Design a protein around this ligand. Structure first.
Ligand SMILES: CC(C)(COP(=O)(O)OP(=O)(O)OC[C@H]1O[C@@H](n2cnc3c(N)ncnc32)[C@H](O)[C@@H]1OP(=O)(O)O)[C@@H](O)C(=O)NCCC(=O)NCCSCCCCC(=O)NCCc1c[nH]c2ccccc12
Length: 166
């Protein structure tokens, strides 16, 4: 009968379009590239939707986290497009908040819910991600520890890998 003021739920492939739209502004306008194109978003939301989370406000997506499983200590280039069903690491591929909803704790709220969400599943023992240097301290607030230069290369951008024990 109405659109809920707030709703948190795992994403589905039908949400791919909304996710990519946010990435356009959140990533592409910044670097001319993003972590997941439409096909890649649909890929993970098809194989492992349970490793995704979305925040909707009045029927519209405002924040999301899309992940998959990884089965190696460190992130690698191939890790970008893979889901290792037998892995024990929740690899956060993309995390973003709609431009009109930032700086109000939504990112922190979503990340914390995500960590508890994935850390409730019988194989996820760790969470891994890569981020720009300036964001390392932000993630340390969630239990993540800096783990050196990430091997993953994206254009002229370099990242610091971070791991969190769950
Ligand atoms: C980062 C965030 C999700 C935070 O959401 P928001 O609700 O506003 O945050 P919050 O809970 O209110 O708290 C914000 C804190 O983050 C800090 N922060 C946000 N943006 C920042 C920036 N550009 N520089 C420095 N600090 C920043 C901010 O200062 C604040 O700290 P304090 O004020 O407390 O000191 C939002 O700013 C956003 O949507 N940014 C645009 C998208 C983005 O850059 N997302 C990545 C998060 S870092 C890594 C997260 C791991 C997954 C992931 O997304 N990996 C892709 C890595 C990747 C980056 N660029 C690529 C290009 C191509 C391929 C891959 C990549």
């Amino acid at each position: 009968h109405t659109l809920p003021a707030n709703e948190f739920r795992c994403l589905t492939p039908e949400d791919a379009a909304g996710v990519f739209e946010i990435e356009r502004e959140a990533f592409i306008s910044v670097s001319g590239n993003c972590p997941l194109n439409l096909d890649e978003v649909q890929h993970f939301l098809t194989l492992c939707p349970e490793l995704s989370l979305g925040w909707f406000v009045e029927g519209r997506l405002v924040a999301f986290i899309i992940g998959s499983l990884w089965d190696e200590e460190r992130l690698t280039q191939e890790s970008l497009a893979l889901h290792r069903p037998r892995g024990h690491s929740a690899h956060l591929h993309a995390l973003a908040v709609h431009r009109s909803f930032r700086q109000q704790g939504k990112g922190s709220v979503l990340l914390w819910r995500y960590l508890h969400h994935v850390g409730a599943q019988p194989a996820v023992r760790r969470a891994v991600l890569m981020c720009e240097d300036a964001l390392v301290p932000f993630y340390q607030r969630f239990g993540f520890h800096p783990a050196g230069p990430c091997a993953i290369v994206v254009g002229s951008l370099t990242f610091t890998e971070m791991h969190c024990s769950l």
